[PDB]
Amino acid sequence: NLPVEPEFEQAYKELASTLENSTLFQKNPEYRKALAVVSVPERVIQFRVVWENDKGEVQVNRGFRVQFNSALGPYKGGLRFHPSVNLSILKFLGFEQIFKNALTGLNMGGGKGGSDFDPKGKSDSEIRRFCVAFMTELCRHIGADTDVPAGDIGVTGREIGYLFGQYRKLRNSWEGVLTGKGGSWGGSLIRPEATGYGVVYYVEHMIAHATNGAESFAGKRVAISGSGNVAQYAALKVIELGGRVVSLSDSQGSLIVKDTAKDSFTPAEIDAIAALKVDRKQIAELVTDAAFADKFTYLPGQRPWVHVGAVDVALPSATQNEVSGEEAQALIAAGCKFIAEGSNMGCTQAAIDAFEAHREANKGAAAIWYAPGKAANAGGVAVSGLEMAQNSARLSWTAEEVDARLKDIMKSCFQNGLDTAKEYATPADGILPSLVTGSNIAGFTKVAAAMKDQGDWW
Template sequence: MYDDLTLEHFMDGLVKRNPYEPEFHQAVKEVAESVIPFINKNPKYKQAHILERMTEPDKVVSFRVSWEDDEGNIRINRGYRVQFNNSIGPYKGGLRFDPSVNMSVLKFLGFEQTFKNSLTTLPIGAGKGGSDFNPKGKSDREIMRFCQSFMTQLYQHIGPNMDVPAGDIGVGAREISYLFGQYKRLTHQFESVLTGKSLEFGGSLIRTEATGYGNAYFMQSMLIHSGQIIEGKTCLVSGSGNVALYCAEKIIQLGGKVLTLSDSSGTLLVPNGIEQTQLDIIKDIKTNKRQRLGVLTELFECEFYEGKKPWSIKADLAFPCATQNELDEDDASLLAEHGCLAVSEGANMPCTPEAVHTFHERGILYAPGKAANAGGVAVSALEMSQNSIRMSWSENELEQKLHNIMQQIHDQCVKYGEHDGKVNYVDGANIAGFIKVADAMLAYGVV
């Protein structure tokens, strides 16, 4: 006979084993709050200590990355790959190049990826990696040399049936191309070992758009389930990277009215709603010219609020698409006071636990990132499939597949999260994601 698992006891053990990793602790606690009551009702998971095993990565790799800058100076960075869980498929998850990268951040992202990838229903495990290298301000040649050095250390740990990384913050098509070129040079193999590749050598259509499009589709499904539609709703979007820009684009296509985008310098407000032509200008200044949003006040009618976040602006829907913990309890209270109906996360863990509690307390529909932003990794898995069968699908076919996957994720959340006619999407996503991985782990025995 086993005593019931308690959240306090479980988290005490996890923090003791993983000290000084606050992002990882936060991600695990959010899942454990949902999953532990389910585990206590299903003793097979408790007896096999599945949650304890699931919160311990399969493997963590750390390595030195030495490279030479344009002035001939030798530079040193640290590289990582956290291979979290491969119970349902090869490890799959992005590489992030950013000064904020450390073990806590990558373990949080890898743990979240376990549930996100499970929810897609596709056969992919979970991993995450990257470096504290900052590509901003670096020349193309410097980025190429860094990527080549990084892959020289990483290549022996990845492979098409072992671990298939993708891009993330600081790692776009350019970086993936340099990484893939070095992998091919080292192994003499043309393999599906990276996703997010350029179309010229095996990339997938709509991969750039997928996370943002998928987030908008999830919001659409959530609203329809509650008897509403996205058309005509005013929307706040934070961030101005690919996720935010393409989330805004799909909202516009679905008839919503996007009021804001943001970057580290402040928030852009377009009171009448951003039009597609304006969004195209914003894409250009952010992705090609790499300028701040504030310059747009000179190009079309808009306002820019220096140092401000979007959440104080009155709107129906919110899409946090920038970075983790960008929306706190005070922001959530402001959204509630202004009548916000629903929040759908485009970034990974952008809402603090206190903000999530406020959403639930105030009756705001809330979609966690592991469900709402799974579109990117879903299309990455489709890219792997296309590479394996040496063919590609059209843009329309891929978008339809993406739409179907997001609907399936929503339906799983409803199945496991609906109580008394209301859906707790956090519980639904966590339990649905847990069951598939946990059942596979049980099937393997003690490994």
């Protein structure tokens, strides 16, 4: 009866294992019934889209719309365009989306939309035909108070614009229904900036909590490892605070300065390598540029983290699991003390669940923060939430206002996760407060609490 959603099976397995591993699930046996209510996504809906390309043909695809958290706000979710989108990855991203989005604190329906409409290799008329034939059928199952598909990495403003164009021309309701609009027609500022800002905000939050505010991006090595947009914003924030960005694991490899503990990357160099990574200008030449070769000893085959040096901040985004069991101890003997993953589940679960033995010996900051990009990435959807408020308030905010909103939101995410892991997950004394168990503790606590209060589970 039950079909196969391999990524969803993996996500559910990890959640259940880390839950029953956590002390909360042991000390609160009633939670053994919460999962059943929350494990099923609240509503996943797809649509048969029949659209003709510019040459003139037929294309019968399926769109995707997911809502996984219904305790906070109307059913939301950012779109993402890739032929790799299907039911499995949809439910996986939702099953982590709930414990990212309830952790966000803001009243936002956890979920994620998307389509297998490829972003490249079709003329803009074909995009318009797809989006029109998509909102021909997506509108009925959405609405500002019911469902508000948003957009993010993979789906640009063009496809979201075409989709809303059909929606507005359809229902005659210029009302916030597609979160992540453009600045002219009711968008938001910091919207692309969300991912880079949020991750570093989470990092500084946990680091400051560890060292009582003494050190937070004050000059430590930041292997941003996200050369593109995510680094373009995160390293901007890092140099605003003062941390010294020191590496990037580009898709070609782990591009690095002369040595991690001896030099640091200029954000201008990060922007240059990112531009050459997206531009047709040779990426290889990019790593061998004058500065990129004399001030920086590019090592696209070895991670800076196994090099140890003095690297602290980590984010294997561009390279999904560049690191592996090769650097088992050297990763943290590097002094990383933290690992997020800019791309969803960037580095595979081996490096996550390892180092649990050393966590007992290490303390707080010393205990690596392999809390995945979940509490960090909230910023993305978080700005989406702010975008919704804009369309609710009918008036665009300012840049500093949205930045303050984001700052408070990451305050909420970090505090909720850490404080829930402190008491519910039995935080390890003389160690970071159950960072890995923090996901399980915070997710189960929020799910059970909002399910009992709202009558979702009883």
